[PDB]
Symmetry: D2
């Protein structure tokens, strides 16, 4: 029970990595607000986690929806100890084909949404004066550009930068800002990525997946439970001297 009596807000928590972080945090004795744009999906997730979980509808692309969501969580819990910025969209396209629509929608969620949710947590944690924890979900894609993934890579590079900036600015208020950079994650996350590479190569139905998996030094694609240990550790006092860092949990797919 490494988070006993702590309160957390996780964005994009209805499914995949965010749902798994909410589960693990409840198992460590935290109260968790699960935020997602889809009220039905986040109601269902809360129903699967039990009475330590609460559902919040939030569109992280809109300031008024951010302020209302935070107001609701603070109203219910009284205070917020931990923000996990996990909401993200994927897109792929050669730079010469990227549309304003895809650009705008991936930047609004991955970068701007993460920034202003971090700001909302930060303002609440400064006012309270008891510190807190902010964990941004970055990506291997944030460490180096790749062809076809310019928009996604740039959004995650900005998440790593804002983790650093906010980390050095907020540590004097006892707020630890850090990031986790997953590698290639299996199942539902992979399928999001795979669906955006259809128009380009699509090399043979499902061979791409075992190749990318085979090429991960560890020998498989990631599962959500590879990340939960790091998500818990960064929210504990054993990590109070860790400030502004991005930790690769990627089976050796990247080195930092």
């Amino acid at each position: 029970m490494r988070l006993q009596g702590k309160t957390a807000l996780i964005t994009g928590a209805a499914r995949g990595i965010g749902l798994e972080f909410a589960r693990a945090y409840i198992a460590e004795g935290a109260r968790v607000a699960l935020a997602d744009i889809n009220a039905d999906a986040v109601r269902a997730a809360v129903e699967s986690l039990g009475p330590q979980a609460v559902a919040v509808q939030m569109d992280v692309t809109r300031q008024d929806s951010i302020d209302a969501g935070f107001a609701e969580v603070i109203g219910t819990f009284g205070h917020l100890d931990i923000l996990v910025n996990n909401a993200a969209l994927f897109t792929a396209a050669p730079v010469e084909e990227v549309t304003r629509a895809d650009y705008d929608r991936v930047m609004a969620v991955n970068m701007t949404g993460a920034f202003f949710c971090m700001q909302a947590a930060a303002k609440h944690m400064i006012a309270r004066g008891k510190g807190g924890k902010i964990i941004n979900m970055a990506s291997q894609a944030g460490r180096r550009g790749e062809p076809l993934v310019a928009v996604y890579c740039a959004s995650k590079a900005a998440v790593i930068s804002m983790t650093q900036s906010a980390g050095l600015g907020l540590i004097r208020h006892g707020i630890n800002v850090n990031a986790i950079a997953p590698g290639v994650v299996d199942g539902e996350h992979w399928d999001m990525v795979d669906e955006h590479f259809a128009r380009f190569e699509g090399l043979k139905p499902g061979e791409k997946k075992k190749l990318v998996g085979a090429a991960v030094p560890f020998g498989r694609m990631g599962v959500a439970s590879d990340l939960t240990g790091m998500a818990i550790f960064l929210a504990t006092a054993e990590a109070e001297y860790i400030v502004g860092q991005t930790f690769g949990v990627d089976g050796g797919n990247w080195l930092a």
Copy 2:
């Protein structure tokens, strides 16, 4: 004379680094379109530098201005060999005070503007099939965050990232995408002179410290350089 028969478009070319690059490219025998939001602020420079220089009114935050400016440069010169993505805005504020207005306006020039200008240059250079050069202006700020400069740092980390992605995607067409990362550039008061004094070289950066690298990356001696960001910062950062 290292850019003879080359054509260049430089954004934010009215003053500072952009102007210094335009003068330098003209001296190396390039034709240069100096682009800025205010065409009058560029007619003076276009006047002194003579007929190898042309003025283009372009606001990099608007797609329709990007389209109009690139069609105008390609229409005047017939082709575009070199893009320098130099248009940039600064803001400072602790993360807790950052306004939507500041965030949007700095992101619109530094990240989105750079990105869609690079795209327009690429569509033309791919079609033409003779290769090309795209030089993005990053910064030491895009290498690591700092406490009061979260918006500016993140916009420049995005520039570094898109230089890498575009670099890897475009080299098969013979297009070299690279970036120059200035350190602190000559642009209560105790801080700028504390920072300036702390540059290992011994002074704050001037625009002309960068012109060497700006010429070099646009020449055939740099043809095997792909998706790189080069620190020209007097030792103020290490990469």
Copy 3:
């Protein structure tokens, strides 16, 4: 009790961070071999830590002492699960004043000693076929050079490099190689003198410039040392993690 039934070998463990790692590991249920060059210091450290500690005299600058020490620990415990490569020396000199004597003795401990201990751990862990954990002590010094610390910085840059190479090479045997990069943790005089300072004045200036607001203590680092040795870190491969109060960013 996150390390119950695990066996560790910690180099440079008679004092400082290595001793505090040994102590924290014993509190998590591990048996710990403390290796150090000084037989009295290491017997005194084991008497202080109690009966879950064992003493191994080991000079990490010699292959004969490395081979003997690992063989002895594997014989005593039956197996070795965790190596902490902690033995290190500090030196400072501007590049134009660096001696062969200083260069040789710091490189022999920090780079060569770390490399050949990691290889002794790897050989045993490959043979046993149950995987293992190797944690290298790097530094902020390994991430970027600085004017007075060329030899120490280069040695820790080599530690990061070999963590990455060995990390990628060994993970198919289930061995996780990773590194901890401390910031400034609480020789000194010689170092302060280059800027015309007393070490007292130096430590205060360095302390104040840490974003967290103070120099590090060993207990800032013990959490990460335990974490990287557990199943919760199984997908972490070849990484170096800064525990440095914000003094560096990675």
Copy 4:
């Protein structure tokens, strides 16, 4: 003629990248000392390059041979403006098989030799008081480890670190210290084909040649690079990003 009147010393210059740097620096008006462990190999290079070139026998692994080699060049030229640290050995083996013999001999040339040659250059350049240029040869291998290349990678990561430390320390004396990081250049046991697999896999479309690097070797030796301090520049066809 970007190096008219300048003097250079290039270590490991008998063949490959060092010889091409020697040729390009001479073509730019420089006097060049070509240093190598093989006196006869570097005497033959000087013969093909002409009298702008001089031959120096130097074993970069021995302090005495470094001091004698720098003494000869300063003797012959009066001063040294530019050092290129180009001497390098390669080795490969998985970490569990690395021998002390391979470790010591690659570290001795790539790391220790480059360090003490850079120190010899710095001491002369500090005494003379007119600044100078030191260009270390790093590698993509120095940016990140890889499984079979632990020794070579660590050697080149140390080269990048010392470039940074030396660069920050020596710029107060008008000495610019920087490095070039080639990718895969032209240039067995553990696995025709394998070479154009790595080659084809370079984003640019081919393995590197010496002439990809000479532009950057010239540029870092000129006043157009005087604000460039402690940097490593990847010239690698996009095979690494930095």
